[PDB]
Structure formats: C-alpha cells, structure tokens
Amino acid sequence: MRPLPAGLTASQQWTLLEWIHMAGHIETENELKAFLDQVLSQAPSERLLLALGRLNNQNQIQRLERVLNVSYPSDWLDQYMKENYAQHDPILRIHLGQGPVMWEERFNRAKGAEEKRFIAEATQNGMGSGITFSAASERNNIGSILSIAGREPGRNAALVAMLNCLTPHLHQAAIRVA
C-alpha cells in the first residue's frame, strides 16, 4: 500500500478523500467515465486515459484487456492502433506498481530505432510529455495504468501525489467494471 501524501492543504486532502470515496462506489463503465471526467476537471491537462491489462511475471502489461479513453484525441488513438505503437511505446513497458513514470525521462532513455520513431510521432501529436501512474494485483495477475498527457501535471507535486494515491482505487473500480 502506497503511503498517503504529506503536505496537502485541507482542501487537497478533502479532494483526495472525495476521490477515493467516489472511486469505491463505481460499479459501471458509465460511472467510471463520469468520475474520470470529474478528476480530469481538476488537473492541468485535458488528456487522460485508463487501461487495464493482464501482466507478465515482471508486472508488465502483456495483453490490454480494456482501454477507457477519457480525452486522448481519437485520431491519435486510431493511429496508435493502426500503426501498432503498443509494441514500441516505452510507456507500455513500465513495471506496474513501481511508482509514477514521467514520460520525458523515460523517452530520453529510448535506444531502439522503432522507439525513437514512436517518440517522434508522439511528440508531434502533443504526447511528448506526461505521466503514467499504475497499480498491480497479484490476486489475478492484472494491472492498471492511468496516463495523463502534458507538462503541467508533473510540475504539481501535490496533484501527482494525489493521483498516485487514487490509482489503486481506480484499479479496483476498473476490475469491478470489467
């Protein structure tokens, strides 16, 4: 269990309390979508996506089970699927539950030609910067990623900590919904 954040204002603590309280009541994809819209309206980004996947023995996604696009541009998602970017996207190689991953840091490390190509294309599409939070369950070999695109989220330490703490509850909700 990841520890709750220190240093939140009373308003931020209350927001996080409401978020986790609400998350625990989510039963349907309708509700899950509506909740993520609510969370979205609180972050310095307009681009959010949640995905559920089956994991390998190193807690990496080996099969995407469910993708809930909240506000990624549909044309980017179409391209991602059409050009099979799942195979080259460094973000899909994260070891889930190992902490928040800043995209720029991860992208700057990419070695392969195909990965560099993807990064170039993501960058052109406004997806060059962002953060991915994650949670994983041993119970059933399943994990979730919550991705938010943009530079500003990562620069708000409080928001990062809040979203990170919310992520395992979004994971439980996503399992219920699936």
Ligand X SMILES: CCCCCCCC(=O)N[C@H]1CCOC1=O
Does residue number 49 form part of the binding site for ligand X (CB under 6 A)?
yes
Interface of this chain with a copy of itself, residues 128 to 157, rule: CB under 8 A: 137, 139
For the chain, after which residues does the C atom lie more than 2.5 Å from the next written residue's N, i.e. where is it broken? Answer: none
Q: With CB cut-offs between 5 and 8 Å by kind, which of ligand X, a copy of itself, none does residue 96 bind? A: none
Long-range CB contacts (within 8 A, 24+) of 98-104? 98/59, 98/134, 99/164, 100/131, 100/132, 100/133, 100/134, 100/160, 100/163, 100/164, 101/131, 101/132, 101/134, 102/130, 102/131, 102/154, 103/127, 103/128, 103/129, 103/130, 103/131, 103/132, 104/128, 104/129
Select the residue interacting with a copy of itself from 10, 11, 82, 111 (CB under 8 A): 10
- Least spacing, CB of residue 17 vs ligand X, in Å: 27
- Least spacing, CB of residue 150 vs a copy of itself, in Å: 26
Binding mask 3-42 for ligand X (x = CB under 6 A): ----------------------------------------
Interface of this chain with ligand X, residues 151 to 170, rule: CB under 6 A: none
Task: Assess contact for 175 and 142: CB atoms under 8 A.
Answer: yes
**Which residues of the shown chain bind a copy of itself in the complex (CB under 8 A)?**
1, 4, 10, 13-14, 16-18, 20-25, 27, 137, 139, 165, 168-169, 172, 176
**Which residues of the shown chain bind ligand X in the complex (CB under 6 A)?**
49, 51, 67, 77, 80-81, 89, 91-92, 103, 122, 127, 132, 147
